[PDB]
């Protein structure tokens, strides 16, 4: 626009929170579907839903991670990454059922002299592969659900050989997208790339996706966020560059059914 | 209103260009694929396009019966020490690999299922005895119904379970089943557990397998030879073919690139190197 | 209750048609019609919030 | 009777 | 003498119909139509002489 | 039996109900062949005593 | 009504909770005002309010107390008594501001051979008198706010003589309504009486009352519930009768403003 | 001829 508006400069406001950016590469709406509340024709639990609106549909910033030349990649699951986030988390643990969409904003700035490219992928049902070749489908609830810290990818598969006290965790190999399929094809999932010369952020608007209208948020993650270095970090001629990556995520149109006492999960 | 068998778009003739319009330049960071066609970057002629995508519609891509299991049964001499073998199979498309890989291009699906049964038999002992023509009973035992413990126990009455009595040497048996999921679609992937581990409860008590939903998702097929024991032993195999008819699919996925290892997405050490050597500047 | 549809005739020797009658109450028993629809790939190829004009800069 | 597509 | 009825279509790929012709004189030979009726449970759930109004006291 | 529905004792939302009782009609409940007996017969050698 | 409807037989339903009673003495709506949300013409904080609706506007049952011949009376403060009640309490501690109305249902059944009468009073700004004659207005936050356990009245004023480590609690004398005014006049406050021969419950619907449209629920209690034996418990010829008293209270039309991190109060 | 339900 002749009044200055740009693809690269955006402002997002949800609840009492605002994000600004001056180096965006537009933003993505997964499968072209904006988040919505559950329609009566698709409804299933009959009790009056709780809809926290601004109390939960606001931007929550997770712990900042660090990108280096040896970084193989990071992953988070939703709603798991937000289970301890203010009133969203409370609403989640107090109800049997819950559904939610999300605005995911990945942040990573650097300088005109740095280079590198992060693939930011939102994957529906992001089932990851386990560390075991003695027992399949064995990753424990606690290890499958890291909360906000997330998990990481590895360049090497290493099988858990402790049979007496097994680690019971994922071993997500990066070129296999942590799930036995080639990473070069992950672009069929809703994505953006943070290529440092071009943009300093990724924004993905995710609808609630599932084979059900509503489900157990505590038992099941709907979306996975996978961030992998498609082109490695590099800067000037420093051997050990570092730049931070921050995730800020906002629940959208979230509603909950089946209110009771609060869930107190075994997380360690 | 565009149908799967419609011809694709014609190529329109296009000439030389010198402008500020830059179709060739783009920015994949946005997450979009550049929608170009040849006339955007070269001079084209007019072509009337006749080709269609009819054979790659979701229906056409899946419109084939695939083998999902082989069930073994027998009918021995009455004098044997070993029990007459009847088969029990937990219904699934994950015991074989080809249909599984095709369905797993997608996260979710809906379809009516056609099951076709091919039945073959043979002799085993270097005998000279014969056997009269066998009838097989294929009983569907849905989750909750009594699973047969013996080839001849009360469950084979089937008052309510659906059963097929197949006669050997006749056309392969076939039935259809509706979309029977308890969800609005079949989940090819379930990133979750069937149990929440609670703090106030023991770890064993809160535990469950990763990615597994209903333990007995769809029940079992139980197959037997209905004929009584025969002096000469005959062994038979029932091959099961699954075809997804009237199918819908959602959320595309990269296909399985390393060998399947169990019903989940797990992989085995030593199978993780699908790609072969090829030099960057070698055609 | 007969349904009459046309064949897309490939090799040739008017419209040639074929006939279909459903014999069963359950639609699950029906054969596949193969009368299927196509859609535009945009939800996967162009999932961006602002409409893309291919002759224009993707970034402005 | 007859449908026609 | 053909009977044409509609299928309740569950999974999808207008009204889809199916056709039925009875081949025998005896109705006992016919297949089951499954075109069945429902009724209210009242003769078993509310067999009381005085009509029950659920917001009111059952005993007055 | 008290003819209650959820909106009688809790707050409910509007739901458009699609489920039916088609498979539990008396006809559908019984629409299966059940085994009621097994009859045994034979055909022996002519020389048999039985 | 000729179809059987009675003053004495009521059903109350809020959220996923229902109360029934067969021995009511009608119910009271304090000052004739039903609870309402804050109107735009009276609004003050400008941020979008949170309105939890069924998640918080439901019946919460507090710990049951016991009525005996030596009971002098009990008191609770609102919202304090509900500060730990499910999502109402969460919403309260996450927000600077909050307002709420309440349905208060006091429960106490006995038998046709028992007797006694409880005065159940809802008092706006129920300021109680302290235990000290060395320092006025000295009751600590912790002692002023018992939460759901509430507090009790006494027949005797006893001044705290420990000057070195003062108790800093209330000393609410029953005939003085715990505040220096005569109990026989407490009937000018919205009330009901549970007189055992007549009724087994009291129901008071309380509007949000205050000199402001909204306020700090954590700093300030709007209503006090005071229950005093106007006529002592008695039964047959037993010297030590006991009957339980249960309080069930539901927030109504509650809304909150000023969302931030959660308040973690010093309560002991 | 044809009945229709
Ligand atoms: C007389 C033979 C009757 C046979 C009846 C078979 C009924 C059971 C149908 C099973 C449907 C299997 C569909 C495939 C698998 C699921 O997609 C995934 N694991 C997700 O739910
Ligand atoms: C519509 O179907 C009316 C025309 C009927 C044409 C002849 C039907 C051929 C035989 C169908 C038998 C019924 C199948 C159960
Ligand atoms: C009504 O039935 C008139 C239409 C006839 C349609 C064709 C009938 C198909 C063959 C039926 C044979 C008779 C069965 C004994």
From Swiss-Prot, chains A, G:
Signal peptide: none annotated. Changing residue 191 to G/T: Complete loss of VP0 cleavage. It is found in: Virion; Host cytoplasm. Interacts with capsid protein VP1 and capsid protein VP3 in the mature capsid. Forms an icosahedral capsid of pseudo T=3 symmetry with capsid proteins VP1 and VP3. The capsid is 300 Angstroms in diameter, composed of 60 copies of each capsid protein and enclosing the viral positive strand RNA genome. This is Capsid protein VP2. It comes from Poliovirus type 1 (strain Mahoney). The lineage of its organism: Viruses, Riboviria, Orthornavirae, Pisuviricota, Pisoniviricetes. The chain holds residues 74 to 341 of 2209 of the full protein.
